[PDB]
Amino acid sequence: RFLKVKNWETDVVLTDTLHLKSTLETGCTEHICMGSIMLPVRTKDQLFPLAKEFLDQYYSSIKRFGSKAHMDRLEEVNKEIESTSTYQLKDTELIYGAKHAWRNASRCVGRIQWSKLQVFDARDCTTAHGMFNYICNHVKYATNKGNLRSAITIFPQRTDGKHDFRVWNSQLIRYAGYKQPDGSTLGDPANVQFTEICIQQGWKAPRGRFDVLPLLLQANGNDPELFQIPPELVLEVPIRHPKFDWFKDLGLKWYGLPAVSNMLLEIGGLEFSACPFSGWYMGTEIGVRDYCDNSRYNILEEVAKKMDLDMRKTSSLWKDQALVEINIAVLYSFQSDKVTIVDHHSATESFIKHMENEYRCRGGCPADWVWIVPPMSGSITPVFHQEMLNYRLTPSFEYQPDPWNTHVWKG
Amino acid sequence: RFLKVKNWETDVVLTDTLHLKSTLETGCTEHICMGSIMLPTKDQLFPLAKEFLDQYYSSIKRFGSKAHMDRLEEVNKEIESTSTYQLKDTELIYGAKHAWRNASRCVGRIQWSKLQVFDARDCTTAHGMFNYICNHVKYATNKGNLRSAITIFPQRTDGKHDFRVWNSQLIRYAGYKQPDGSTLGDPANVQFTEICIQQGWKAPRGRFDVLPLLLQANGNDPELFQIPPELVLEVPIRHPKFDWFKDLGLKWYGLPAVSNMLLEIGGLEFSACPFSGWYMGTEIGVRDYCDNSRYNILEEVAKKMDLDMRKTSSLWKDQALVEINIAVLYSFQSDKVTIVDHHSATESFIKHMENEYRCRGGCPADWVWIVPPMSGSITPVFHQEMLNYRLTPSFEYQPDPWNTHVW
Ligand code: HEM
Ligand code: HEM
Ligand SMILES: COc1ccccc1CNCCO[C@@H]1CNC[C@@H]1Cc1cc(C)cc(N)n1
Ligand SMILES: COc1ccccc1CNCCO[C@@H]1CNC[C@@H]1Cc1cc(C)cc(N)n1
Ligand SMILES: C[C@H](O)[C@H](O)[C@H]1CNc2nc(N)[nH]c(=O)c2N1
Ligand SMILES: C[C@H](O)[C@H](O)[C@H]1CNc2nc(N)[nH]c(=O)c2N1
Ligand SMILES: [Zn+2]
């Protein structure tokens, strides 16, 4: 079967055949679409099919499908599974796997970059201190003094589900949040619960508006341990505005390195529960979401006050007006400091070119519209007008429960 | 089978039970989500009739009463005897209000129960359709104090005698391809404008010419009518700060009025059912004015503001966008023509969802359509999980008549 997507701005029609390789389910049915829902220990029996699919894909990509090397590798994995109940990926398979998980990430607008990913194999890691060292090297490498490089670090896979490696931080670099007795929050309200855990674990909190959180690292199912990332390794950008000189006095800054650390990488049926990955920011992630969500830094009011906008009626579009100025400031600040960042116009345009390329060469590009369209100025970006098909390919990045809900404390 | 929706801003969780009565299909499967696709006889009719009359009699607290049973029998008799049936006025009013209540792509549904229904089922000619439409236009406009309305022409019979308004909206501006090469007026209406011209319309060939209505009665060939200009309320667009804004020479009409959809009530199909309310500002300022394939005025406005257009990252598009949208709202407000901004409209819709969850057990919503085309995440609907499903009565899309009609 063939499925068609139209672009309503250009009349370009694309044909998707790749959806036919989709195994995992969406959450939708013929009766309900769950396309805006945020979140919609294996047997030998289930594992060999999953290994086999993956290795067929791997061997096709290198143009070795059906070769003796392909067949030997199948038999070798077959045997390893029946005997040890799991298997180990070759380095080449791990790299390929990690790239394809990003390639297949339908909520990611940055996928034009998927083939340039530095993969750090941390499968020889055994302790939290070992994880810290690996994560430091990743941060240093990825930061590269502001000239950001995409990377992922991959810690040992799940075995019995009792020995999981986890990074408890949701991102490697984030700011603490502190709930005050008066109900207000200092710092980032998204991070209050995790900040509370860090404190209970013995972190001494500076208690400011931009305190970089310590890493909380679990190796081998053991209790997590605290580590402070060396501050010289944490690149930060002070936010100022090109025409508004009062903007710097808001006291705003952000970190340069977006690095997601709470997801699970599935490759060939294996589950990598700690696989922090990083790229570079699209401006709106900071300027729209981090700064202007009501449940985050929520600075729209204070900015609009300072701009002397008419604030008595929403219909002045004061919020929209302040929103644009903050986003200009974020992009200006990163650019002035020579820290890589991409605006939403440039990122969405590139994504459209990527998606079209993917249709021609791969027969599809799964994409989640709800996530791909930027959170400001949606319809003046070319993706708004682009029909998309969302479906699940493996290898993949998946969500997993927060570890403080599942972890068996050892004491 | 009982489903949760969460708001990620407020942590409020709602439980949806209403989806279990969804009848029509979505386009999605367990394997593939089609959430972002624009367009994804005797025997069939009685189930549909029963389903509808059952909900109707439940709504007036008379489910299972003799008056309920007697109507079901009467309708059964009529279908068996005549191959179709006729709705009572009360059923028609209820069906129309509910097609709107069920419209998952409509952010304005807090208003659903205040809908003026004009019963045009006695209409027989295109001139009759024109009279009914002028009256609708004048009632809804109400000197700028807009009132929601729908006018319902006769239902489909054998499908060879369809009533249709050929216009996509009652009030739209013409579009002409130029010797230049570009496009004068609204590029969306170029083809419809050609059909008008080929059927006799004398076009003034300007940027903002109100198109004529093209009306089809009883499956006959459509006929042209100009709407009395005095009934088409229009707004010149100016900015509260930028004096030069007026010089672009922009105007828009006050009455949004969709006229190409099909109303389905209890299995009956009303192929001509123009309806109208009032605008959310972004529909005009973001979509009509700024879509590349529309009036596409971003480039010209940015220039008048003297912004740096060398690089996308100065956000000159975003800056100009907000101003265009401030101007729309300001101009409608100054001329006392009802309009709603996207902040107010999305806030009301969140309130409406909560009402519908509390009183009905759900509210079908299409997030892709409900979230405004500018400033998405600073409106509360961005953070609201929504379940999309199809309930009946409904407004449905239908093919453009020029592709179906034989002359
Ligand atoms: C190269 C620069 C990149 C840019 C500009 C970019 C852009 C983005 C943005 C804007 C989001 C949405 C985040 C949100 O709204 O919460 C996202 C999501 C995501 N991206 Fe990227 N991306 C980049 C690199 C990467 C890399 C290197 C990977 C993995 C190797 C990746 C995988 C993902 C995944 C799995 C998500 C979904 C996250 C979630 O569901 O919470 N991206 N991307
Ligand atoms: C009272 C003020 C109203 C407001 C502010 C409003 C708001 C909107 C908006 C912004 C859209 C999306 C339009 C687009 O982006 O193309 C829409 C769509 C829609 N509305 Fe409303 N609405 C109103 C009244 C009505 C009424 C009176 C009806 C029917 C009786 C209705 C039924 C629909 C339907 C069926 C759609 C989807 C149109 C399509 O699929 O192309 N709405 N509404
Ligand atoms: C309450 O939050 C949630 C809950 C469930 C699922 C997803 C989320 C939100 N997404 C979490 C990850 O997204 C963060 C937001 N900004 C940076 C990061 C995404 C990202 C990753 C990378 C590698 C690059 C980039 N530019 N952006
Ligand atoms: C190119 O456009 C399309 C093509 C196919 C399907 C749907 C669409 C989009 N809908 C077309 C009709 O919608 C128009 C857009 N602005 C006004 C009207 C929607 C509307 C209706 C009503 C009753 C009120 C309101 N405020 N807005
Ligand atoms: C409920 C809704 O799905 C949710 O708010 C989504 C919408 N789109 C998004 N898009 C991105 N890129 N990131 C997000 O966190 C969200 N949140
Ligand atoms: C392809 C995509 O579905 C299309 O551009 C949609 C997106 N959301 C929309 N939302 C509204 N309200 N109106 C529209 O016309 C569209 N267009
Ligand atoms: Zn779906």
Rg (alpha carbons) of chain B, rounded to whole number = 23
Tokens standing for B364? 């079908």
Given a contact cutoff of 8 angstroms between Cβ atoms, the answer to whether A218 and A128 are in contact is: yes
Q: In angstroms, what is the resolution?
A: 2.0
With beta carbons under 8 A apart, name residues in chain A contacting B386: 36
Q: Which residues pair with A152 in a beta bridge?
A: A119, A277
Max Cα separation, chain A?
74
Tokens standing for B356? 């519908």
Sign, CA torsion A90/A96/A100/A102:
positive
Confirm whether B310 is a catalytic residue: no
Q: If DSSP codes are grouped into helix, strand and coil, which group holds residue B169?
A: strand
End-to-end CA distance of chain A: 55
How is the beta sheet containing B213-216 ordered, strand by strand? Answer: B164-165, B213-216, B223-225
DSSP codes joined into one string, B282-300 = HIIIIIIHH-TTTT--HHH
Give the H/E segment covering residue B234: strand B234-236
Give the H/E segment covering residue B165: strand B164-165
What residue type is assigned to position A288 of the chain? Answer: V
What residue type is assigned to position B255 of the chain? Answer: L
DSSP codes joined into one string, A210-252 = TPBPPEEEE-TTPPPEEEPPPGGG--EEE---SS-GGGGGG--
End-to-end CA distance of chain B: 50
**Residue at token pair 């970089």:** A212
Residue A49 neighbours by CB distance under 10 Å: 11
Produce one character per residue of B108-125: b if its CB has 16 or more CB atoms within 10 Å, e if not.
bbbbbeebebbbbeebee
> Residue A188: left if φ>0, alpha if ψ -120 to 50, beta else—which one?
beta
Residue A371 neighbours by CB distance under 10 Å: 17
Given a contact cutoff of 8 angstroms between Cβ atoms, the answer to whether A290 and A187 are in contact is: no
CA dist A6 and A321 (Å) reads 32
Given a contact cutoff of 8 angstroms between Cβ atoms, the answer to whether B364 and B104 are in contact is: yes
CA dist B308 and B319 (Å) reads 11
Produce one character per residue of B350-372: b if its CB has 16 or more CB atoms within 10 Å, e if not.
bebbeebbeeebbbbbbbbbbbb
Alpha-helical (H) ranges within A241-337 are: 283-284, 291-292, 300-306, 318-336
CA dist B162 and A205 (Å) reads 73
Tokens standing for A223? 């209790």
> Residue B95: left if φ>0, alpha if ψ -120 to 50, beta else—which one?
alpha
Ligand 7 center to B39 CA (angstroms): 13
Q: Which residues pair with B215 in a beta bridge?
A: B165, B223
Phi, psi of B248 (to 5 degrees): -65, -20
Ligand 2 center to B146 CA (angstroms): 14
Q: Which residues pair with A267 in a beta bridge?
A: A270
CA dist A177 and A185 (Å) reads 7
Given a contact cutoff of 8 angstroms between Cβ atoms, the answer to whether A54 and A268 are in contact is: yes
Given a contact cutoff of 8 angstroms between Cβ atoms, the answer to whether B120 and B129 are in contact is: yes
CA dist A156 and A120 (Å) reads 12
Ligand 3 center to A398 CA (angstroms): 12
Give the H/E segment covering residue B360: helix B342-360
B368: Cβ below 6 Å to ligand 6? yes
CA dist A397 and A275 (Å) reads 9
Max Cα separation, chain B?
74
Determine the distance in angstroms separating the CA of A24 from the nearest CA of chain B, rounded to an integer.
7
**Cis check: omega of the bond before A181, within 30 degrees of 0:** no
Which domains does chain A carry?
A: 16-123+150-160+264-278+348-372 (3.90.340.10), 124-149+164-235+399-403 (3.90.440.10), 236-258+281-346 (3.90.1230.10)
Q: If DSSP codes are grouped into helix, strand and coil, which group holds residue A361?
A: helix
CA dist B203 and B176 (Å) reads 9
What residue type is assigned to position A218 of the chain? Answer: Q
Burial class (CB in 10 A: 0-12, 13-18, 19+), A104: buried
CA dist B7 and B367 (Å) reads 12
What residue type is assigned to position A300 of the chain? Answer: L
Task: Spell out where B350-396 has E strands.
Answer: 394-396
CA dist A391 and A388 (Å) reads 10
Q: Work out whether strand B257-258 and strand B275-276 pair parallel, antiparallel, or are unpaired.
A: antiparallel
CA dist A290 and B218 (Å) reads 58
Residue in A37, A314, A387 closest to B341 by CB: A314
Produce one character per residue of B44-70: b if its CB has 16 or more CB atoms within 10 Å, e if not.
ebbebbeebbebbbeeeeeeeeeebee
Q: Which residues of A are catalytic?
A: 108, 111, 280, 285
A275: Cβ below 6 Å to ligand 3? no
Q: If DSSP codes are grouped into helix, strand and coil, which group holds residue B280?
A: strand
Residue in B312, B343, B382 closest to A319 by CB: B343
Burial class (CB in 10 A: 0-12, 13-18, 19+), B41: exposed
Give the H/E segment covering residue A101: helix A91-103
Q: If DSSP codes are grouped into helix, strand and coil, which group holds residue B370?
A: helix
A8: Cβ below 6 Å to ligand 6? yes
Residue whose CA is closest, atom 14 of ligand 6? B369
Give the H/E segment covering residue B359: helix B342-360
Sign, CA torsion B78/B81/B84/B86:
negative
Sign, CA torsion B78/B83/B89/B94:
positive
Contact B6 A327 (CB under 8 A): no
CB within 5 A of ion ligand 7: which residues? Answer: A 28, 33, 35; B 28, 33, 35
Give the H/E segment covering residue A142: helix A128-143
Q: Work out whether strand A396-398 and strand B13-16 pair parallel, antiparallel, or are unpaired.
A: unpaired
CA dist B394 and B102 (Å) reads 6
Given a contact cutoff of 8 angstroms between Cβ atoms, the answer to whether B176 and B185 are in contact is: yes
CA dist A377 and B4 (Å) reads 29
Tokens standing for B388? 């999309």
B170: Cβ below 6 Å to ligand 4? no
Q: Which residues pair with A278 in a beta bridge?
A: A151, A259
> Residue B68: left if φ>0, alpha if ψ -120 to 50, beta else—which one?
alpha
Q: Give the residue from B261, B256, B323 showing the smallest Cα distance to B283.
A: B256
What residue type is assigned to position A111 of the chain? Answer: R
Q: How many CA atoms lie within 13 A of B261 on its CB side?
A: 20
Tokens standing for A98? 């990690």
Produce one character per residue of A79-89: b if its CB has 16 or more CB atoms within 10 Å, e if not.
eebeeeebbeb
Q: Give the residue from A244, A260, A264, A263 showing the smallest Cα distance to A252.
A: A244
CA dist B373 and B317 (Å) reads 14
Q: Which atom of ligand 4 is nearest to the CA of B39?
A: 6
Nearest CA in chain A to B291: A380
Given a contact cutoff of 8 angstroms between Cβ atoms, the answer to whether A70 and A63 are in contact is: no
Given a contact cutoff of 8 angstroms between Cβ atoms, the answer to whether B192 and B166 are in contact is: yes
Contact B9 A320 (CB under 8 A): no
Given a contact cutoff of 8 angstroms between Cβ atoms, the answer to whether A319 and B343 are in contact is: yes
State which approach was used to obtain the coordinates.
X-ray
CA dist B295 and B68 (Å) reads 53
Catalytic one among B223, B278, B316, B363? B278
Q: Which residues pair with A15 in a beta bridge?
A: A4
How far is residue A327 CA from its own chain's centroid? 21
Given a contact cutoff of 8 angstroms between Cβ atoms, the answer to whether A34 and B387 are in contact is: yes
Q: If DSSP codes are grouped into helix, strand and coil, which group holds residue A301?
A: helix
What residue type is assigned to position A261 of the chain? Answer: S
Given a contact cutoff of 8 angstroms between Cβ atoms, the answer to whether B386 and B366 are in contact is: yes
What residue type is assigned to position A6 of the chain? Answer: K
Q: Give the residue from B21, B164, B26, B49 showing the smallest Cα distance to B105.
A: B26
Rg (alpha carbons) of chain A, rounded to whole number = 23
